[PDB]
Every structure is written in C-alpha cells, then in structure tokens.
Amino acid sequence: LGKFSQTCYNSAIQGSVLTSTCERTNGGYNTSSIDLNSVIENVDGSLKWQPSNFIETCRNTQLAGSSELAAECKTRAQQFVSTKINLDDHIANIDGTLKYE
Amino acid sequence: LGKFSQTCYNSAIQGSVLTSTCERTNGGYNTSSIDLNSVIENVDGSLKWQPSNFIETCRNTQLAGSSELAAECKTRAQQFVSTKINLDDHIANIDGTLKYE
C-alpha cells in the first residue's frame, strides 16, 4: 500500500494537509492534496494510522433541523442506508466559535 | 456537552463542514466552521462520534524527507513529545492523485 513518494515531487505539509505533484499513467502530472486529519491520530503522543474518513463512504450530507447531521452511508455490505447524528451532542458554541468537546 | 444550536443561527452543512453564526458572551456574533471528518465516523452505515483530531493536540507538523510526517504531539500527561509517521504506509499516487488506502 501507499508509496506515493516514489512517483511524486514537490511534496509539502501544511497543517494536516499533504500536497504533492504526481505522475499520471499516460504521462504528465497532477497536483493534489489530502487532509490527513481523518486518517491519522495522536495516541498518547505518537502518531498512528486511523480508519478512513466519513465523506469517503457517505454521501448527500445535510443539516436536518437545527443540529442534526443526516447522510446516506455505506454499510460493511457496501449498501447505502439512511443515518443521522445529533451535532448538539459534542459541538458547542465557545464564545462565538464552534468547537468539539 | 455541545448544545451549540441553542445560541447560533444560519447553520449549514457542506460536505463534512458545519458553519454557523454564534452569539459571543459580550454580545455580538461570530461565524465559524468546523470540519466533522475527524470527529465523526461511519460504522457499518451508522454515523458515530469519534475521538478528536490530531492537529488539536499536535503542533509544528512538517514533511521530513520525501514521505515522513513529523510533529510534536501531546501525551496523556499533557506533555509534548517528538513523533513521526511514514506517509508512504498508506498514501498512494493513483494516476496522479493522492489517495488513502
């Protein structure tokens, strides 16, 4: 798995985002970025790999009502089902700024 | 915990990002956003809460060499220690685009 560095150049990290210019199969290059926040985590001071994101396996995300996140997400069986989660559970307004807690 | 909806308005979800205009203590408002990708995950088709991000507890992220992500991260004891992870482990170049696998 991985090995992007072997066929890319001008790689850089800014915050949690990795950007690099990579070779395409038919030749030529493309510059792209990837946010590592959803795949890497800090476990007691050590960076460790983490499962994949949520937007990679869920679609049609919407704000239902005033605090509900709704979406259609893939099951282990690769089928989409309806799901929702109350953002009021952990998203707070800390003096005007949205913060997770 | 949470309860942001009670003191905010004009909330919206785009992709994995929640944006809202919230009341400040001293009065007045502030608009802010939060990327839910690092705190919510898809578990067999159901959205579930997830630990916090990595940029919230790590600082000075840098690309070391051609594929190493280096940073100073907080331990359970709240002290910063040096850590690194090889991005070549899971980041691949798929026809010119960086993708996790």
PDB file of all heavy atoms in Angstrom, chain B residues 71-95:
ATOM      1  N   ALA B  71       5.972  15.741  13.814  1.00  0.00           N
ATOM      2  CA  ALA B  71       5.257  16.702  14.634  1.00  0.00           C
ATOM      3  C   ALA B  71       5.568  16.495  16.106  1.00  0.00           C
ATOM      4  O   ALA B  71       6.209  15.517  16.489  1.00  0.00           O
ATOM      5  CB  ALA B  71       3.753  16.577  14.398  1.00  0.00           C
ATOM      6  N   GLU B  72       5.119  17.442  16.916  1.00  0.00           N
ATOM      7  CA  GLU B  72       5.277  17.395  18.363  1.00  0.00           C
ATOM      8  C   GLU B  72       3.854  17.190  18.864  1.00  0.00           C
ATOM      9  O   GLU B  72       2.989  18.039  18.650  1.00  0.00           O
ATOM     10  CB  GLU B  72       5.845  18.723  18.874  1.00  0.00           C
ATOM     11  CG  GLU B  72       7.318  18.922  18.552  1.00  0.00           C
ATOM     12  CD  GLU B  72       7.710  20.389  18.467  1.00  0.00           C
ATOM     13  OE1 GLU B  72       7.118  21.216  19.192  1.00  0.00           O
ATOM     14  OE2 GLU B  72       8.622  20.716  17.681  1.00  0.00           O
ATOM     15  N   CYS B  73       3.603  16.055  19.507  1.00  0.00           N
ATOM     16  CA  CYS B  73       2.261  15.751  19.988  1.00  0.00           C
ATOM     17  C   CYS B  73       2.162  15.586  21.497  1.00  0.00           C
ATOM     18  O   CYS B  73       3.095  15.115  22.143  1.00  0.00           O
ATOM     19  CB  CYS B  73       1.751  14.472  19.337  1.00  0.00           C
ATOM     20  SG  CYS B  73       1.483  14.491  17.534  1.00  0.00           S
ATOM     21  N   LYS B  74       1.006  15.956  22.041  1.00  0.00           N
ATOM     22  CA  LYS B  74       0.752  15.846  23.472  1.00  0.00           C
ATOM     23  C   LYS B  74       0.452  14.416  23.908  1.00  0.00           C
ATOM     24  O   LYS B  74      -0.279  13.688  23.237  1.00  0.00           O
ATOM     25  CB  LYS B  74      -0.433  16.728  23.870  1.00  0.00           C
ATOM     26  CG  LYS B  74      -0.146  18.215  23.856  1.00  0.00           C
ATOM     27  CD  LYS B  74      -1.418  19.029  24.064  1.00  0.00           C
ATOM     28  CE  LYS B  74      -2.113  18.668  25.367  1.00  0.00           C
ATOM     29  NZ  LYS B  74      -3.376  19.437  25.539  1.00  0.00           N
ATOM     30  N   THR B  75       1.021  14.024  25.042  1.00  0.00           N
ATOM     31  CA  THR B  75       0.798  12.697  25.599  1.00  0.00           C
ATOM     32  C   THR B  75      -0.424  12.795  26.507  1.00  0.00           C
ATOM     33  O   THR B  75      -1.000  13.871  26.671  1.00  0.00           O
ATOM     34  CB  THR B  75       1.987  12.246  26.455  1.00  0.00           C
ATOM     35  OG1 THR B  75       2.130  13.140  27.566  1.00  0.00           O
ATOM     36  CG2 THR B  75       3.267  12.254  25.639  1.00  0.00           C
ATOM     37  N   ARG B  76      -0.818  11.671  27.096  1.00  0.00           N
ATOM     38  CA  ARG B  76      -1.959  11.652  28.003  1.00  0.00           C
ATOM     39  C   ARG B  76      -1.647  12.567  29.184  1.00  0.00           C
ATOM     40  O   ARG B  76      -2.547  13.154  29.787  1.00  0.00           O
ATOM     41  CB  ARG B  76      -2.204  10.227  28.508  1.00  0.00           C
ATOM     42  CG  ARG B  76      -2.488   9.209  27.417  1.00  0.00           C
ATOM     43  CD  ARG B  76      -3.904   9.336  26.877  1.00  0.00           C
ATOM     44  NE  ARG B  76      -4.174   8.376  25.805  1.00  0.00           N
ATOM     45  CZ  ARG B  76      -4.025   7.059  25.918  1.00  0.00           C
ATOM     46  NH1 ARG B  76      -3.598   6.528  27.056  1.00  0.00           N
ATOM     47  NH2 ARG B  76      -4.299   6.271  24.886  1.00  0.00           N
ATOM     48  N   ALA B  77      -0.360  12.684  29.501  1.00  0.00           N
ATOM     49  CA  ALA B  77       0.103  13.512  30.608  1.00  0.00           C
ATOM     50  C   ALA B  77       0.174  14.991  30.240  1.00  0.00           C
ATOM     51  O   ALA B  77       0.658  15.810  31.021  1.00  0.00           O
ATOM     52  CB  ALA B  77       1.467  13.026  31.082  1.00  0.00           C
ATOM     53  N   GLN B  78      -0.299  15.322  29.042  1.00  0.00           N
ATOM     54  CA  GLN B  78      -0.327  16.701  28.560  1.00  0.00           C
ATOM     55  C   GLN B  78       1.040  17.316  28.267  1.00  0.00           C
ATOM     56  O   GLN B  78       1.202  18.535  28.332  1.00  0.00           O
ATOM     57  CB  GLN B  78      -1.077  17.586  29.559  1.00  0.00           C
ATOM     58  CG  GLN B  78      -2.471  17.081  29.891  1.00  0.00           C
ATOM     59  CD  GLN B  78      -3.330  16.902  28.655  1.00  0.00           C
ATOM     60  OE1 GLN B  78      -3.605  17.858  27.932  1.00  0.00           O
ATOM     61  NE2 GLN B  78      -3.754  15.668  28.404  1.00  0.00           N
ATOM     62  N   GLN B  79       2.021  16.483  27.942  1.00  0.00           N
ATOM     63  CA  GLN B  79       3.357  16.973  27.627  1.00  0.00           C
ATOM     64  C   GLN B  79       3.658  16.667  26.164  1.00  0.00           C
ATOM     65  O   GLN B  79       3.243  15.631  25.651  1.00  0.00           O
ATOM     66  CB  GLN B  79       4.392  16.296  28.529  1.00  0.00           C
ATOM     67  CG  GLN B  79       4.149  16.530  30.011  1.00  0.00           C
ATOM     68  CD  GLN B  79       5.144  15.805  30.891  1.00  0.00           C
ATOM     69  OE1 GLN B  79       5.280  14.583  30.818  1.00  0.00           O
ATOM     70  NE2 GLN B  79       5.844  16.555  31.734  1.00  0.00           N
ATOM     71  N   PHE B  80       4.364  17.570  25.490  1.00  0.00           N
ATOM     72  CA  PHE B  80       4.700  17.364  24.083  1.00  0.00           C
ATOM     73  C   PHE B  80       5.954  16.524  23.880  1.00  0.00           C
ATOM     74  O   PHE B  80       6.976  16.744  24.532  1.00  0.00           O
ATOM     75  CB  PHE B  80       4.885  18.703  23.360  1.00  0.00           C
ATOM     76  CG  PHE B  80       3.600  19.391  23.007  1.00  0.00           C
ATOM     77  CD1 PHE B  80       2.933  20.174  23.942  1.00  0.00           C
ATOM     78  CD2 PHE B  80       3.059  19.263  21.731  1.00  0.00           C
ATOM     79  CE1 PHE B  80       1.745  20.825  23.607  1.00  0.00           C
ATOM     80  CE2 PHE B  80       1.873  19.908  21.387  1.00  0.00           C
ATOM     81  CZ  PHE B  80       1.215  20.691  22.327  1.00  0.00           C
ATOM     82  N   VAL B  81       5.859  15.556  22.974  1.00  0.00           N
ATOM     83  CA  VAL B  81       6.977  14.684  22.647  1.00  0.00           C
ATOM     84  C   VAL B  81       7.090  14.626  21.126  1.00  0.00           C
ATOM     85  O   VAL B  81       6.127  14.917  20.410  1.00  0.00           O
ATOM     86  CB  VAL B  81       6.777  13.253  23.208  1.00  0.00           C
ATOM     87  CG1 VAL B  81       6.719  13.296  24.728  1.00  0.00           C
ATOM     88  CG2 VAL B  81       5.505  12.643  22.648  1.00  0.00           C
ATOM     89  N   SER B  82       8.269  14.258  20.635  1.00  0.00           N
ATOM     90  CA  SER B  82       8.505  14.165  19.200  1.00  0.00           C
ATOM     91  C   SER B  82       7.973  12.851  18.642  1.00  0.00           C
ATOM     92  O   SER B  82       8.132  11.797  19.254  1.00  0.00           O
ATOM     93  CB  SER B  82      10.003  14.272  18.896  1.00  0.00           C
ATOM     94  OG  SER B  82      10.528  15.521  19.311  1.00  0.00           O
ATOM     95  N   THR B  83       7.345  12.920  17.476  1.00  0.00           N
ATOM     96  CA  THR B  83       6.807  11.727  16.837  1.00  0.00           C
ATOM     97  C   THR B  83       6.805  11.885  15.322  1.00  0.00           C
ATOM     98  O   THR B  83       6.885  12.997  14.802  1.00  0.00           O
ATOM     99  CB  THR B  83       5.366  11.436  17.328  1.00  0.00           C
ATOM    100  OG1 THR B  83       4.871  10.251  16.691  1.00  0.00           O
ATOM    101  CG2 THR B  83       4.439  12.597  17.010  1.00  0.00           C
ATOM    102  N   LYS B  84       6.737  10.765  14.614  1.00  0.00           N
ATOM    103  CA  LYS B  84       6.697  10.804  13.164  1.00  0.00           C
ATOM    104  C   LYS B  84       6.010   9.556  12.645  1.00  0.00           C
ATOM    105  O   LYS B  84       5.892   8.553  13.356  1.00  0.00           O
ATOM    106  CB  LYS B  84       8.109  10.932  12.579  1.00  0.00           C
ATOM    107  CG  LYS B  84       9.028   9.754  12.842  1.00  0.00           C
ATOM    108  CD  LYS B  84      10.452  10.091  12.409  1.00  0.00           C
ATOM    109  CE  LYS B  84      11.402   8.924  12.604  1.00  0.00           C
ATOM    110  NZ  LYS B  84      11.095   7.790  11.690  1.00  0.00           N
ATOM    111  N   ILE B  85       5.545   9.631  11.406  1.00  0.00           N
ATOM    112  CA  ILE B  85       4.851   8.520  10.780  1.00  0.00           C
ATOM    113  C   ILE B  85       5.153   8.563   9.290  1.00  0.00           C
ATOM    114  O   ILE B  85       5.199   9.640   8.692  1.00  0.00           O
ATOM    115  CB  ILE B  85       3.327   8.633  11.050  1.00  0.00           C
ATOM    116  CG1 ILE B  85       2.602   7.401  10.511  1.00  0.00           C
ATOM    117  CG2 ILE B  85       2.778   9.916  10.444  1.00  0.00           C
ATOM    118  CD1 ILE B  85       1.154   7.319  10.964  1.00  0.00           C
ATOM    119  N   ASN B  86       5.393   7.397   8.695  1.00  0.00           N
ATOM    120  CA  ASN B  86       5.713   7.327   7.273  1.00  0.00           C
ATOM    121  C   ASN B  86       4.447   7.345   6.425  1.00  0.00           C
ATOM    122  O   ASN B  86       3.693   6.369   6.398  1.00  0.00           O
ATOM    123  CB  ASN B  86       6.508   6.058   6.967  1.00  0.00           C
ATOM    124  CG  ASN B  86       7.182   6.108   5.610  1.00  0.00           C
ATOM    125  OD1 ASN B  86       6.777   6.868   4.729  1.00  0.00           O
ATOM    126  ND2 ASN B  86       8.213   5.292   5.429  1.00  0.00           N
ATOM    127  N   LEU B  87       4.221   8.449   5.725  1.00  0.00           N
ATOM    128  CA  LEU B  87       3.038   8.574   4.890  1.00  0.00           C
ATOM    129  C   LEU B  87       3.023   7.565   3.743  1.00  0.00           C
ATOM    130  O   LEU B  87       1.963   7.268   3.197  1.00  0.00           O
ATOM    131  CB  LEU B  87       2.912  10.010   4.367  1.00  0.00           C
ATOM    132  CG  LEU B  87       2.743  11.071   5.469  1.00  0.00           C
ATOM    133  CD1 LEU B  87       2.602  12.445   4.833  1.00  0.00           C
ATOM    134  CD2 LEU B  87       1.527  10.760   6.336  1.00  0.00           C
ATOM    135  N   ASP B  88       4.183   7.023   3.377  1.00  0.00           N
ATOM    136  CA  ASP B  88       4.214   6.026   2.309  1.00  0.00           C
ATOM    137  C   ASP B  88       3.495   4.742   2.736  1.00  0.00           C
ATOM    138  O   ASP B  88       3.222   3.875   1.906  1.00  0.00           O
ATOM    139  CB  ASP B  88       5.651   5.676   1.900  1.00  0.00           C
ATOM    140  CG  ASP B  88       6.217   6.620   0.856  1.00  0.00           C
ATOM    141  OD1 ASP B  88       5.434   7.235   0.104  1.00  0.00           O
ATOM    142  OD2 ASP B  88       7.457   6.729   0.773  1.00  0.00           O
ATOM    143  N   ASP B  89       3.193   4.614   4.027  1.00  0.00           N
ATOM    144  CA  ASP B  89       2.492   3.431   4.523  1.00  0.00           C
ATOM    145  C   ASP B  89       1.104   3.281   3.902  1.00  0.00           C
ATOM    146  O   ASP B  89       0.689   2.174   3.551  1.00  0.00           O
ATOM    147  CB  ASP B  89       2.282   3.491   6.041  1.00  0.00           C
ATOM    148  CG  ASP B  89       3.560   3.365   6.837  1.00  0.00           C
ATOM    149  OD1 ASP B  89       4.627   3.054   6.263  1.00  0.00           O
ATOM    150  OD2 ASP B  89       3.472   3.575   8.068  1.00  0.00           O
ATOM    151  N   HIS B  90       0.392   4.398   3.774  1.00  0.00           N
ATOM    152  CA  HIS B  90      -0.980   4.379   3.271  1.00  0.00           C
ATOM    153  C   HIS B  90      -1.377   5.418   2.224  1.00  0.00           C
ATOM    154  O   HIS B  90      -2.508   5.399   1.740  1.00  0.00           O
ATOM    155  CB  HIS B  90      -1.943   4.499   4.457  1.00  0.00           C
ATOM    156  CG  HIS B  90      -1.989   3.284   5.328  1.00  0.00           C
ATOM    157  ND1 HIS B  90      -2.742   2.172   5.014  1.00  0.00           N
ATOM    158  CD2 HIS B  90      -1.374   3.001   6.501  1.00  0.00           C
ATOM    159  CE1 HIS B  90      -2.589   1.258   5.956  1.00  0.00           C
ATOM    160  NE2 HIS B  90      -1.764   1.737   6.870  1.00  0.00           N
ATOM    161  N   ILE B  91      -0.482   6.338   1.883  1.00  0.00           N
ATOM    162  CA  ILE B  91      -0.823   7.341   0.880  1.00  0.00           C
ATOM    163  C   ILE B  91      -0.220   6.934  -0.452  1.00  0.00           C
ATOM    164  O   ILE B  91       1.003   6.813  -0.595  1.00  0.00           O
ATOM    165  CB  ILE B  91      -0.316   8.741   1.278  1.00  0.00           C
ATOM    166  CG1 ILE B  91      -0.837   9.110   2.672  1.00  0.00           C
ATOM    167  CG2 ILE B  91      -0.784   9.762   0.252  1.00  0.00           C
ATOM    168  CD1 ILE B  91      -2.346   9.049   2.812  1.00  0.00           C
ATOM    169  N   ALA B  92      -1.092   6.712  -1.426  1.00  0.00           N
ATOM    170  CA  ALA B  92      -0.660   6.288  -2.743  1.00  0.00           C
ATOM    171  C   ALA B  92      -0.950   7.308  -3.831  1.00  0.00           C
ATOM    172  O   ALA B  92      -1.782   8.205  -3.667  1.00  0.00           O
ATOM    173  CB  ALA B  92      -1.331   4.967  -3.094  1.00  0.00           C
ATOM    174  N   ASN B  93      -0.235   7.160  -4.942  1.00  0.00           N
ATOM    175  CA  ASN B  93      -0.430   8.007  -6.105  1.00  0.00           C
ATOM    176  C   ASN B  93      -1.279   7.186  -7.068  1.00  0.00           C
ATOM    177  O   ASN B  93      -0.782   6.266  -7.720  1.00  0.00           O
ATOM    178  CB  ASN B  93       0.906   8.356  -6.767  1.00  0.00           C
ATOM    179  CG  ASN B  93       0.728   8.959  -8.147  1.00  0.00           C
ATOM    180  OD1 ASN B  93      -0.350   9.445  -8.484  1.00  0.00           O
ATOM    181  ND2 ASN B  93       1.788   8.943  -8.947  1.00  0.00           N
ATOM    182  N   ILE B  94      -2.567   7.502  -7.131  1.00  0.00           N
ATOM    183  CA  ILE B  94      -3.474   6.793  -8.027  1.00  0.00           C
ATOM    184  C   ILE B  94      -3.681   7.666  -9.259  1.00  0.00           C
ATOM    185  O   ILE B  94      -4.477   8.607  -9.242  1.00  0.00           O
ATOM    186  CB  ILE B  94      -4.845   6.518  -7.356  1.00  0.00           C
ATOM    187  CG1 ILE B  94      -4.650   5.781  -6.026  1.00  0.00           C
ATOM    188  CG2 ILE B  94      -5.722   5.686  -8.289  1.00  0.00           C
ATOM    189  CD1 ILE B  94      -4.031   4.401  -6.146  1.00  0.00           C
ATOM    190  N   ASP B  95      -2.936   7.352 -10.315  1.00  0.00           N
ATOM    191  CA  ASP B  95      -2.994   8.073 -11.580  1.00  0.00           C
ATOM    192  C   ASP B  95      -2.910   9.591 -11.433  1.00  0.00           C
ATOM    193  O   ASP B  95      -3.684  10.335 -12.043  1.00  0.00           O
ATOM    194  CB  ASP B  95      -4.261   7.674 -12.349  1.00  0.00           C
ATOM    195  CG  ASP B  95      -4.277   8.211 -13.771  1.00  0.00           C
ATOM    196  OD1 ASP B  95      -3.194   8.335 -14.380  1.00  0.00           O
ATOM    197  OD2 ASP B  95      -5.381   8.494 -14.288  1.00  0.00           O
TER     198      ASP B  95
END
